[PDB]
Amino acid sequence: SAYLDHAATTPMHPAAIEAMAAVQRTIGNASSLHTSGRSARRRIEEARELIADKLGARPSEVIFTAGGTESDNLAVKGIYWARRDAEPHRRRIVTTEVEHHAVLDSVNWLVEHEGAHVTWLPTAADGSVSATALREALQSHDDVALVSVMWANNEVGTILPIAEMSVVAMEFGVPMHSDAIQAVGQLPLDFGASGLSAMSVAGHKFGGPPGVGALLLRRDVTCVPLMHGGGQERDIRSGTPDVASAVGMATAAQIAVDGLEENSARLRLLRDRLVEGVLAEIDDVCLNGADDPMRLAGNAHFTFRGCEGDALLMLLDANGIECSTGSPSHVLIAMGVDAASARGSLRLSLGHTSVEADVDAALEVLPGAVARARRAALA
Amino acid sequence: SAYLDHAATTPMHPAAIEAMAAVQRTIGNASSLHTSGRSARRRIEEARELIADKLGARPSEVIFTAGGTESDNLAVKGIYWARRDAEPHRRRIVTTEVEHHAVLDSVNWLVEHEGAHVTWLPTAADGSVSATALREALQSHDDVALVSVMWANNEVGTILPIAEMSVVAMEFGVPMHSDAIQAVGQLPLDFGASGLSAMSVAGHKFGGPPGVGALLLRRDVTCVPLMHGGGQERDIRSGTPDVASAVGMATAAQIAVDGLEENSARLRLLRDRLVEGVLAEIDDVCLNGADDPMRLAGNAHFTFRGCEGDALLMLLDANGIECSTGSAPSHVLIAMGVDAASARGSLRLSLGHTSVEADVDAALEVLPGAVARARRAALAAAG
């Protein structure tokens, strides 16, 4: 298969499979007092430090989770609660319209279930949000519980201005969370140096085990737990510590962040060649999202007029090209593209294992496939 | 080096390690519509089916979680909320005082934060709780949102009468959850045959990978999610499905539950040899928790008068005997009527699928010396 669905998941690094199988062969609960316990404990502590190192955090800032979704729920609901509980006036969530469901659905739920209110930051046709728009919604609202803004979008690849949005949030004394699940090993990540109160990351998105993640959280931000007890993870997130998955995520984190520079460069070329080929050989197609240097290196997103994206995906699949439609995408809606127009969408995404031929394959196959999808949609 | 802490974690089955390795070698998101995706989906759905079969559930009753803590949390909070939100008067949780912390602390947080109320069922000297006591609690309260009683205790080994308690809950139309985390691979569990609205399990306790569990939940019992953004698992629990872990948990479930009868009897003989040994060679000691036939096959739990559990543990460890104090002074012993002073010299020795004769021999050899040192160490620090 030509695999071009890296943004949905990317192949686990062989070395991470190996490091993880080796933990699995030793016995021990990291919570236990005996020799096996203190070993496991020391392995989980080394993984935590390697992770913090590679994300510009301090080891104690890393709260392991069972994936991106968990991490995003914890930040959003946890912090909302902590803030609302201490000052019941503070009920407003400021967030973007282009968030992953993991955030949006968390937000909508706090709204329906927890008396939350939400202000949606306006979105550019880019798919971006700006530091100013944040300042404007912060100044005109005295009831901001928290802020959540994603670092890079997972459908259209737009990088957001987090660093400078963070300094804004700091200014108003408002904790800011960012979903950086698409960022690890794709752009430079420095938790400490960003202003962030909280940051989400997900193993499998950079060659880690699936079912493991982290929330980076600052020592002084209160967060009400979603999982009780008794707080194996800084009293924020209970459950028996999963050492094998932490170790897996660490090895991954290390390969992926050390290779950040070289790999970005390699994927930009591959992706630009793909974007170029696509627009050269196909009529009525456009790129969505931002241009360099405000886009993920590995991401290509199109709309093909007069197509169903589902038809398209199935025809490409039949020919050995594996990709995704991305989702009527709330993210394209947010960028002011229209319902009809938008159903013709396709995300093609590359990662550590992509090669020239994967691009040669997509370009070979695509025109035949878009023709067929258009024929079919014409009835 | 004798491992006697199987109740905290049991060694992963090597076939479960292999199956999991194999999955992580293939690429695919189970929610993806292309070929690799459909393969991932086909793999997770088979694991699910294997798990259902082995636990007497229908496939769609199985919801994958990140472990037993997640599973207990989802059941207790999520069903509470589903009940409270439908009839704001049902705010009461009926539970036992012996529950694992993942239930106690969930119950507590609901009390502190979500307006819950709690009635604690009375606990016998045994560690045990009865169907009658549940009856009286449901007759005498008209506001109960949810019942949660664990199938077997993780400290003292006691098995509770879930089938007959489940029936009582059914008669007052109140959903019941049971933490069965200790029961899988040690007891014949059949979600179908029990009346349970819900039941929790954790892979690592019967030899599956860490950070994977399941909640078994009836098709008609509503449950508010704790993880949103998906919800990939019947809309109850979001997250990209973890295919490797679930296949692992399945490979383990089929070994654990097929070996059930054989393993059970084998551990009984070991445990019993272990308990008899201890009581012969040591003074002022007792066994805690119910007797056969209401006790897990691999669980031995003792109190030694005149010890700190910690010094005793460190001594045993120094001599290659690895075990636990159980907690957390144990809330379980407190609830069985054991006083906090007496409580303090407690020790859980727990057998599992890799347990061999030599393990019990090692414990029997080292124990008298250990106990005697712990007693002397306790007197001299009071001195």
PDB file of C-alpha atoms in Angstrom, chain B residues 11-275:
ATOM      1  CA  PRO B  11       3.273 -11.614  34.830  1.00  0.00           C
ATOM      2  CA  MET B  12       2.176 -10.955  31.237  1.00  0.00           C
ATOM      3  CA  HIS B  13       1.445 -14.102  29.178  1.00  0.00           C
ATOM      4  CA  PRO B  14       4.213 -14.551  26.599  1.00  0.00           C
ATOM      5  CA  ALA B  15       1.694 -15.368  23.887  1.00  0.00           C
ATOM      6  CA  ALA B  16      -0.022 -12.073  24.780  1.00  0.00           C
ATOM      7  CA  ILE B  17       3.336 -10.318  24.319  1.00  0.00           C
ATOM      8  CA  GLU B  18       3.685 -11.905  20.831  1.00  0.00           C
ATOM      9  CA  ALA B  19       0.179 -11.131  19.590  1.00  0.00           C
ATOM     10  CA  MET B  20       0.679  -7.516  20.695  1.00  0.00           C
ATOM     11  CA  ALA B  21       4.076  -7.240  19.006  1.00  0.00           C
ATOM     12  CA  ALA B  22       2.589  -8.565  15.790  1.00  0.00           C
ATOM     13  CA  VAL B  23      -0.195  -5.916  15.805  1.00  0.00           C
ATOM     14  CA  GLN B  24       2.183  -3.059  16.389  1.00  0.00           C
ATOM     15  CA  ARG B  25       4.077  -4.161  13.288  1.00  0.00           C
ATOM     16  CA  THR B  26       1.104  -3.391  11.049  1.00  0.00           C
ATOM     17  CA  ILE B  27      -0.235   0.069  10.190  1.00  0.00           C
ATOM     18  CA  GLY B  28      -3.819   1.164  10.633  1.00  0.00           C
ATOM     19  CA  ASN B  29      -6.458   3.194  12.391  1.00  0.00           C
ATOM     20  CA  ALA B  30      -9.467   1.113  13.135  1.00  0.00           C
ATOM     21  CA  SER B  31     -11.822   4.042  12.277  1.00  0.00           C
ATOM     22  CA  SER B  32     -10.221   4.478   8.841  1.00  0.00           C
ATOM     23  CA  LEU B  33     -12.227   3.334   5.803  1.00  0.00           C
ATOM     24  CA  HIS B  34      -9.272   2.158   3.654  1.00  0.00           C
ATOM     25  CA  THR B  35      -7.835  -1.383   3.642  1.00  0.00           C
ATOM     26  CA  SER B  36      -5.358  -1.101   6.500  1.00  0.00           C
ATOM     27  CA  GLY B  37      -8.086   0.565   8.529  1.00  0.00           C
ATOM     28  CA  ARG B  38     -10.599  -2.202   7.809  1.00  0.00           C
ATOM     29  CA  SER B  39      -7.916  -4.680   8.916  1.00  0.00           C
ATOM     30  CA  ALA B  40      -7.313  -2.894  12.187  1.00  0.00           C
ATOM     31  CA  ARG B  41     -11.117  -2.882  12.709  1.00  0.00           C
ATOM     32  CA  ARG B  42     -11.331  -6.608  11.858  1.00  0.00           C
ATOM     33  CA  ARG B  43      -8.586  -7.280  14.467  1.00  0.00           C
ATOM     34  CA  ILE B  44     -10.120  -5.267  17.261  1.00  0.00           C
ATOM     35  CA  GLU B  45     -13.629  -6.664  16.576  1.00  0.00           C
ATOM     36  CA  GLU B  46     -12.227 -10.245  16.925  1.00  0.00           C
ATOM     37  CA  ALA B  47     -10.533  -9.469  20.200  1.00  0.00           C
ATOM     38  CA  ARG B  48     -13.817  -7.990  21.429  1.00  0.00           C
ATOM     39  CA  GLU B  49     -15.637 -11.214  20.382  1.00  0.00           C
ATOM     40  CA  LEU B  50     -13.066 -13.389  22.156  1.00  0.00           C
ATOM     41  CA  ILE B  51     -13.466 -11.291  25.311  1.00  0.00           C
ATOM     42  CA  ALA B  52     -17.316 -11.377  25.161  1.00  0.00           C
ATOM     43  CA  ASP B  53     -17.374 -15.136  24.703  1.00  0.00           C
ATOM     44  CA  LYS B  54     -15.024 -15.704  27.638  1.00  0.00           C
ATOM     45  CA  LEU B  55     -16.985 -13.365  29.942  1.00  0.00           C
ATOM     46  CA  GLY B  56     -20.552 -14.477  28.866  1.00  0.00           C
ATOM     47  CA  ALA B  57     -21.239 -11.082  27.243  1.00  0.00           C
ATOM     48  CA  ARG B  58     -22.585 -10.137  23.867  1.00  0.00           C
ATOM     49  CA  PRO B  59     -19.738  -8.471  21.757  1.00  0.00           C
ATOM     50  CA  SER B  60     -21.431  -5.077  21.803  1.00  0.00           C
ATOM     51  CA  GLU B  61     -21.533  -5.294  25.570  1.00  0.00           C
ATOM     52  CA  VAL B  62     -17.735  -4.928  25.603  1.00  0.00           C
ATOM     53  CA  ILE B  63     -16.394  -1.407  25.841  1.00  0.00           C
ATOM     54  CA  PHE B  64     -12.556  -1.067  25.810  1.00  0.00           C
ATOM     55  CA  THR B  65     -10.949   1.216  28.402  1.00  0.00           C
ATOM     56  CA  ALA B  66      -7.430   2.012  29.568  1.00  0.00           C
ATOM     57  CA  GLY B  67      -7.659  -0.272  32.593  1.00  0.00           C
ATOM     58  CA  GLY B  68      -9.639  -1.148  35.698  1.00  0.00           C
ATOM     59  CA  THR B  69      -9.476   2.331  37.219  1.00  0.00           C
ATOM     60  CA  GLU B  70     -10.952   3.849  34.019  1.00  0.00           C
ATOM     61  CA  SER B  71     -13.516   1.114  33.828  1.00  0.00           C
ATOM     62  CA  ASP B  72     -14.678   1.691  37.490  1.00  0.00           C
ATOM     63  CA  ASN B  73     -14.723   5.405  37.012  1.00  0.00           C
ATOM     64  CA  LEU B  74     -16.803   5.265  33.879  1.00  0.00           C
ATOM     65  CA  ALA B  75     -19.332   2.939  35.454  1.00  0.00           C
ATOM     66  CA  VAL B  76     -19.746   4.776  38.739  1.00  0.00           C
ATOM     67  CA  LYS B  77     -19.630   8.387  37.615  1.00  0.00           C
ATOM     68  CA  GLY B  78     -21.157   7.794  34.153  1.00  0.00           C
ATOM     69  CA  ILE B  79     -24.098   5.769  35.303  1.00  0.00           C
ATOM     70  CA  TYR B  80     -24.625   8.049  38.301  1.00  0.00           C
ATOM     71  CA  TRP B  81     -24.853  11.000  35.996  1.00  0.00           C
ATOM     72  CA  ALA B  82     -27.149   9.104  33.598  1.00  0.00           C
ATOM     73  CA  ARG B  83     -29.474   8.294  36.446  1.00  0.00           C
ATOM     74  CA  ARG B  84     -29.297  11.728  38.208  1.00  0.00           C
ATOM     75  CA  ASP B  85     -29.784  13.669  34.939  1.00  0.00           C
ATOM     76  CA  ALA B  86     -32.928  11.632  34.135  1.00  0.00           C
ATOM     77  CA  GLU B  87     -34.563  11.978  37.603  1.00  0.00           C
ATOM     78  CA  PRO B  88     -32.696  14.642  39.693  1.00  0.00           C
ATOM     79  CA  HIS B  89     -33.899  12.978  42.907  1.00  0.00           C
ATOM     80  CA  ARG B  90     -31.844   9.776  42.370  1.00  0.00           C
ATOM     81  CA  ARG B  91     -28.584  10.931  43.842  1.00  0.00           C
ATOM     82  CA  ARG B  92     -27.763   7.961  46.015  1.00  0.00           C
ATOM     83  CA  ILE B  93     -25.017   5.459  45.581  1.00  0.00           C
ATOM     84  CA  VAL B  94     -25.199   2.139  47.396  1.00  0.00           C
ATOM     85  CA  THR B  95     -21.797   0.547  47.776  1.00  0.00           C
ATOM     86  CA  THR B  96     -19.663  -1.537  50.202  1.00  0.00           C
ATOM     87  CA  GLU B  97     -16.875  -0.159  52.477  1.00  0.00           C
ATOM     88  CA  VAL B  98     -14.471  -2.721  51.160  1.00  0.00           C
ATOM     89  CA  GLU B  99     -14.315  -1.408  47.611  1.00  0.00           C
ATOM     90  CA  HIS B 100     -11.065  -0.750  45.701  1.00  0.00           C
ATOM     91  CA  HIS B 101     -10.029   2.862  45.722  1.00  0.00           C
ATOM     92  CA  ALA B 102     -11.038   3.351  42.098  1.00  0.00           C
ATOM     93  CA  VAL B 103     -14.653   2.961  43.300  1.00  0.00           C
ATOM     94  CA  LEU B 104     -14.375   4.620  46.786  1.00  0.00           C
ATOM     95  CA  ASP B 105     -12.699   7.710  45.418  1.00  0.00           C
ATOM     96  CA  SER B 106     -15.148   7.925  42.516  1.00  0.00           C
ATOM     97  CA  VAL B 107     -18.010   7.661  45.004  1.00  0.00           C
ATOM     98  CA  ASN B 108     -16.421  10.241  47.166  1.00  0.00           C
ATOM     99  CA  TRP B 109     -15.832  12.750  44.406  1.00  0.00           C
ATOM    100  CA  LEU B 110     -19.468  12.493  43.421  1.00  0.00           C
ATOM    101  CA  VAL B 111     -20.458  13.144  47.056  1.00  0.00           C
ATOM    102  CA  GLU B 112     -18.135  16.233  47.254  1.00  0.00           C
ATOM    103  CA  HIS B 113     -18.740  17.569  43.793  1.00  0.00           C
ATOM    104  CA  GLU B 114     -21.920  16.213  42.155  1.00  0.00           C
ATOM    105  CA  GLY B 115     -24.349  16.181  45.093  1.00  0.00           C
ATOM    106  CA  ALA B 116     -24.296  12.373  45.548  1.00  0.00           C
ATOM    107  CA  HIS B 117     -25.300  10.578  48.734  1.00  0.00           C
ATOM    108  CA  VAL B 118     -23.848   7.280  49.898  1.00  0.00           C
ATOM    109  CA  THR B 119     -25.243   4.390  51.936  1.00  0.00           C
ATOM    110  CA  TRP B 120     -22.591   1.907  52.988  1.00  0.00           C
ATOM    111  CA  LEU B 121     -23.753  -1.644  53.233  1.00  0.00           C
ATOM    112  CA  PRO B 122     -22.619  -3.220  56.586  1.00  0.00           C
ATOM    113  CA  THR B 123     -19.526  -5.444  56.410  1.00  0.00           C
ATOM    114  CA  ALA B 124     -19.161  -8.783  58.179  1.00  0.00           C
ATOM    115  CA  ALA B 125     -15.960  -9.873  60.135  1.00  0.00           C
ATOM    116  CA  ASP B 126     -15.522 -11.857  56.953  1.00  0.00           C
ATOM    117  CA  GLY B 127     -14.955  -8.993  54.588  1.00  0.00           C
ATOM    118  CA  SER B 128     -18.319 -10.096  53.331  1.00  0.00           C
ATOM    119  CA  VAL B 129     -21.641  -8.389  52.531  1.00  0.00           C
ATOM    120  CA  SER B 130     -25.090 -10.033  51.962  1.00  0.00           C
ATOM    121  CA  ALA B 131     -28.067  -9.949  49.642  1.00  0.00           C
ATOM    122  CA  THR B 132     -30.384  -9.131  52.584  1.00  0.00           C
ATOM    123  CA  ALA B 133     -28.412  -6.075  53.506  1.00  0.00           C
ATOM    124  CA  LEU B 134     -28.862  -4.804  49.975  1.00  0.00           C
ATOM    125  CA  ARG B 135     -32.633  -5.448  50.150  1.00  0.00           C
ATOM    126  CA  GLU B 136     -32.978  -3.371  53.311  1.00  0.00           C
ATOM    127  CA  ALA B 137     -31.000  -0.536  51.785  1.00  0.00           C
ATOM    128  CA  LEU B 138     -33.205  -0.405  48.652  1.00  0.00           C
ATOM    129  CA  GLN B 139     -36.491  -0.831  50.568  1.00  0.00           C
ATOM    130  CA  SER B 140     -35.582   1.952  52.898  1.00  0.00           C
ATOM    131  CA  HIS B 141     -34.492   4.484  50.191  1.00  0.00           C
ATOM    132  CA  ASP B 142     -36.385   5.828  47.231  1.00  0.00           C
ATOM    133  CA  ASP B 143     -33.543   7.880  45.694  1.00  0.00           C
ATOM    134  CA  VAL B 144     -30.927   5.323  44.620  1.00  0.00           C
ATOM    135  CA  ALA B 145     -29.137   6.008  41.360  1.00  0.00           C
ATOM    136  CA  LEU B 146     -26.767   3.046  41.331  1.00  0.00           C
ATOM    137  CA  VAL B 147     -25.463  -0.066  43.118  1.00  0.00           C
ATOM    138  CA  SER B 148     -21.736  -1.052  43.081  1.00  0.00           C
ATOM    139  CA  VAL B 149     -20.365  -4.125  44.866  1.00  0.00           C
ATOM    140  CA  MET B 150     -17.056  -5.774  43.952  1.00  0.00           C
ATOM    141  CA  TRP B 151     -17.109  -9.429  43.014  1.00  0.00           C
ATOM    142  CA  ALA B 152     -14.009 -10.301  44.962  1.00  0.00           C
ATOM    143  CA  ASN B 153     -11.874  -8.361  47.361  1.00  0.00           C
ATOM    144  CA  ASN B 154      -8.300  -7.564  46.324  1.00  0.00           C
ATOM    145  CA  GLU B 155      -6.917  -7.578  49.899  1.00  0.00           C
ATOM    146  CA  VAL B 156      -8.499 -10.414  51.862  1.00  0.00           C
ATOM    147  CA  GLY B 157      -9.785 -12.691  49.047  1.00  0.00           C
ATOM    148  CA  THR B 158     -13.446 -12.740  49.917  1.00  0.00           C
ATOM    149  CA  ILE B 159     -15.965 -13.516  47.165  1.00  0.00           C
ATOM    150  CA  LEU B 160     -19.311 -11.664  47.463  1.00  0.00           C
ATOM    151  CA  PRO B 161     -22.791 -12.973  46.497  1.00  0.00           C
ATOM    152  CA  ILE B 162     -23.145 -10.947  43.276  1.00  0.00           C
ATOM    153  CA  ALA B 163     -25.604 -13.238  41.463  1.00  0.00           C
ATOM    154  CA  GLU B 164     -28.083 -12.987  44.331  1.00  0.00           C
ATOM    155  CA  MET B 165     -27.429  -9.308  44.954  1.00  0.00           C
ATOM    156  CA  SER B 166     -27.877  -8.622  41.262  1.00  0.00           C
ATOM    157  CA  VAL B 167     -31.385 -10.094  41.398  1.00  0.00           C
ATOM    158  CA  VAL B 168     -32.306  -7.803  44.294  1.00  0.00           C
ATOM    159  CA  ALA B 169     -31.112  -4.776  42.346  1.00  0.00           C
ATOM    160  CA  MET B 170     -33.231  -5.976  39.386  1.00  0.00           C
ATOM    161  CA  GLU B 171     -36.360  -6.191  41.571  1.00  0.00           C
ATOM    162  CA  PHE B 172     -36.087  -2.488  42.595  1.00  0.00           C
ATOM    163  CA  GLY B 173     -35.146  -1.524  39.026  1.00  0.00           C
ATOM    164  CA  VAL B 174     -31.764  -0.123  40.043  1.00  0.00           C
ATOM    165  CA  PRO B 175     -28.729  -0.710  37.880  1.00  0.00           C
ATOM    166  CA  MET B 176     -25.853  -2.583  39.565  1.00  0.00           C
ATOM    167  CA  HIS B 177     -22.175  -2.483  38.734  1.00  0.00           C
ATOM    168  CA  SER B 178     -19.569  -4.907  40.019  1.00  0.00           C
ATOM    169  CA  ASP B 179     -15.821  -4.464  40.079  1.00  0.00           C
ATOM    170  CA  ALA B 180     -14.830  -8.029  38.837  1.00  0.00           C
ATOM    171  CA  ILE B 181     -11.208  -7.109  38.368  1.00  0.00           C
ATOM    172  CA  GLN B 182     -10.003  -9.813  40.725  1.00  0.00           C
ATOM    173  CA  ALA B 183     -12.415 -12.418  39.480  1.00  0.00           C
ATOM    174  CA  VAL B 184     -11.403 -12.835  35.815  1.00  0.00           C
ATOM    175  CA  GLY B 185      -9.386 -16.063  35.494  1.00  0.00           C
ATOM    176  CA  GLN B 186     -10.034 -16.902  39.156  1.00  0.00           C
ATOM    177  CA  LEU B 187     -13.856 -17.493  39.165  1.00  0.00           C
ATOM    178  CA  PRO B 188     -16.444 -18.497  36.564  1.00  0.00           C
ATOM    179  CA  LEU B 189     -17.759 -15.088  35.490  1.00  0.00           C
ATOM    180  CA  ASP B 190     -20.824 -14.886  33.264  1.00  0.00           C
ATOM    181  CA  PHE B 191     -22.128 -11.381  32.727  1.00  0.00           C
ATOM    182  CA  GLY B 192     -25.175 -12.836  30.936  1.00  0.00           C
ATOM    183  CA  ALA B 193     -26.097 -15.175  33.816  1.00  0.00           C
ATOM    184  CA  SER B 194     -25.521 -12.491  36.528  1.00  0.00           C
ATOM    185  CA  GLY B 195     -28.088  -9.746  36.348  1.00  0.00           C
ATOM    186  CA  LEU B 196     -25.385  -7.077  36.103  1.00  0.00           C
ATOM    187  CA  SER B 197     -25.994  -3.789  34.365  1.00  0.00           C
ATOM    188  CA  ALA B 198     -22.249  -3.375  34.413  1.00  0.00           C
ATOM    189  CA  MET B 199     -18.973  -5.062  35.208  1.00  0.00           C
ATOM    190  CA  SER B 200     -15.264  -3.983  35.215  1.00  0.00           C
ATOM    191  CA  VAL B 201     -12.145  -5.916  34.213  1.00  0.00           C
ATOM    192  CA  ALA B 202      -8.444  -5.159  33.906  1.00  0.00           C
ATOM    193  CA  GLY B 203      -5.967  -7.010  31.587  1.00  0.00           C
ATOM    194  CA  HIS B 204      -2.925  -6.918  33.822  1.00  0.00           C
ATOM    195  CA  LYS B 205      -4.541  -8.960  36.520  1.00  0.00           C
ATOM    196  CA  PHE B 206      -4.919 -12.110  34.372  1.00  0.00           C
ATOM    197  CA  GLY B 207      -1.806 -11.643  32.311  1.00  0.00           C
ATOM    198  CA  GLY B 208      -2.764  -9.137  29.646  1.00  0.00           C
ATOM    199  CA  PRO B 209      -0.955  -5.863  28.911  1.00  0.00           C
ATOM    200  CA  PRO B 210      -1.046  -2.934  31.446  1.00  0.00           C
ATOM    201  CA  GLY B 211      -3.191   0.108  30.533  1.00  0.00           C
ATOM    202  CA  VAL B 212      -6.071  -1.867  29.025  1.00  0.00           C
ATOM    203  CA  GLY B 213      -9.336  -2.887  30.662  1.00  0.00           C
ATOM    204  CA  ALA B 214     -12.978  -3.243  29.692  1.00  0.00           C
ATOM    205  CA  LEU B 215     -16.363  -2.216  30.902  1.00  0.00           C
ATOM    206  CA  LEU B 216     -19.135  -4.678  30.163  1.00  0.00           C
ATOM    207  CA  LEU B 217     -22.385  -2.708  29.912  1.00  0.00           C
ATOM    208  CA  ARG B 218     -25.938  -3.801  28.998  1.00  0.00           C
ATOM    209  CA  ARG B 219     -27.257  -2.517  25.713  1.00  0.00           C
ATOM    210  CA  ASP B 220     -30.006  -0.567  27.515  1.00  0.00           C
ATOM    211  CA  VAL B 221     -28.206   1.036  30.446  1.00  0.00           C
ATOM    212  CA  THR B 222     -27.393   4.688  29.741  1.00  0.00           C
ATOM    213  CA  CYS B 223     -23.918   5.890  30.557  1.00  0.00           C
ATOM    214  CA  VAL B 224     -22.580   9.495  30.269  1.00  0.00           C
ATOM    215  CA  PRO B 225     -19.102   9.480  28.778  1.00  0.00           C
ATOM    216  CA  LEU B 226     -15.999  10.475  30.717  1.00  0.00           C
ATOM    217  CA  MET B 227     -13.873  10.538  27.523  1.00  0.00           C
ATOM    218  CA  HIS B 228     -15.493  12.683  24.821  1.00  0.00           C
ATOM    219  CA  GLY B 229     -14.600  13.215  21.231  1.00  0.00           C
ATOM    220  CA  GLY B 230     -15.521  10.246  19.155  1.00  0.00           C
ATOM    221  CA  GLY B 231     -17.150   8.150  20.853  1.00  0.00           C
ATOM    222  CA  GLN B 232     -15.539   5.233  19.105  1.00  0.00           C
ATOM    223  CA  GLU B 233     -16.885   2.742  21.592  1.00  0.00           C
ATOM    224  CA  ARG B 234     -20.699   2.854  21.483  1.00  0.00           C
ATOM    225  CA  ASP B 235     -20.489   6.613  22.157  1.00  0.00           C
ATOM    226  CA  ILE B 236     -19.654   5.916  25.794  1.00  0.00           C
ATOM    227  CA  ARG B 237     -15.845   6.151  25.555  1.00  0.00           C
ATOM    228  CA  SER B 238     -13.873   8.154  22.923  1.00  0.00           C
ATOM    229  CA  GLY B 239     -10.268   7.700  21.798  1.00  0.00           C
ATOM    230  CA  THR B 240      -8.534   6.118  18.867  1.00  0.00           C
ATOM    231  CA  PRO B 241      -9.104   2.360  19.453  1.00  0.00           C
ATOM    232  CA  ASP B 242      -5.987   0.586  20.699  1.00  0.00           C
ATOM    233  CA  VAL B 243      -5.804  -2.597  18.664  1.00  0.00           C
ATOM    234  CA  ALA B 244      -2.556  -4.002  20.012  1.00  0.00           C
ATOM    235  CA  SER B 245      -3.672  -3.797  23.646  1.00  0.00           C
ATOM    236  CA  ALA B 246      -7.100  -5.206  23.092  1.00  0.00           C
ATOM    237  CA  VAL B 247      -5.713  -8.252  21.109  1.00  0.00           C
ATOM    238  CA  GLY B 248      -3.255  -8.797  23.955  1.00  0.00           C
ATOM    239  CA  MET B 249      -6.023  -8.641  26.543  1.00  0.00           C
ATOM    240  CA  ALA B 250      -7.961 -11.184  24.412  1.00  0.00           C
ATOM    241  CA  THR B 251      -5.080 -13.621  24.055  1.00  0.00           C
ATOM    242  CA  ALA B 252      -4.766 -13.455  27.868  1.00  0.00           C
ATOM    243  CA  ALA B 253      -8.474 -13.727  28.592  1.00  0.00           C
ATOM    244  CA  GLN B 254      -8.672 -16.987  26.517  1.00  0.00           C
ATOM    245  CA  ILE B 255      -5.687 -18.506  28.336  1.00  0.00           C
ATOM    246  CA  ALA B 256      -6.932 -17.310  31.789  1.00  0.00           C
ATOM    247  CA  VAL B 257     -10.568 -18.364  31.478  1.00  0.00           C
ATOM    248  CA  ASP B 258      -9.850 -21.713  29.670  1.00  0.00           C
ATOM    249  CA  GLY B 259      -7.302 -22.684  32.346  1.00  0.00           C
ATOM    250  CA  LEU B 260      -9.734 -21.538  35.079  1.00  0.00           C
ATOM    251  CA  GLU B 261     -10.671 -24.963  36.687  1.00  0.00           C
ATOM    252  CA  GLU B 262      -7.163 -26.413  36.476  1.00  0.00           C
ATOM    253  CA  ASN B 263      -5.388 -23.234  37.682  1.00  0.00           C
ATOM    254  CA  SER B 264      -7.896 -22.732  40.425  1.00  0.00           C
ATOM    255  CA  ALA B 265      -7.413 -26.142  42.026  1.00  0.00           C
ATOM    256  CA  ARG B 266      -3.643 -25.908  41.623  1.00  0.00           C
ATOM    257  CA  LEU B 267      -3.462 -22.551  43.477  1.00  0.00           C
ATOM    258  CA  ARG B 268      -5.812 -23.818  46.166  1.00  0.00           C
ATOM    259  CA  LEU B 269      -3.380 -26.554  47.103  1.00  0.00           C
ATOM    260  CA  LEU B 270      -0.514 -24.019  47.155  1.00  0.00           C
ATOM    261  CA  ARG B 271      -2.374 -21.331  49.138  1.00  0.00           C
ATOM    262  CA  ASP B 272      -3.577 -23.895  51.620  1.00  0.00           C
ATOM    263  CA  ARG B 273      -0.089 -25.261  52.090  1.00  0.00           C
ATOM    264  CA  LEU B 274       1.057 -21.725  52.551  1.00  0.00           C
ATOM    265  CA  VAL B 275      -1.570 -20.823  55.170  1.00  0.00           C
TER     266      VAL B 275
END
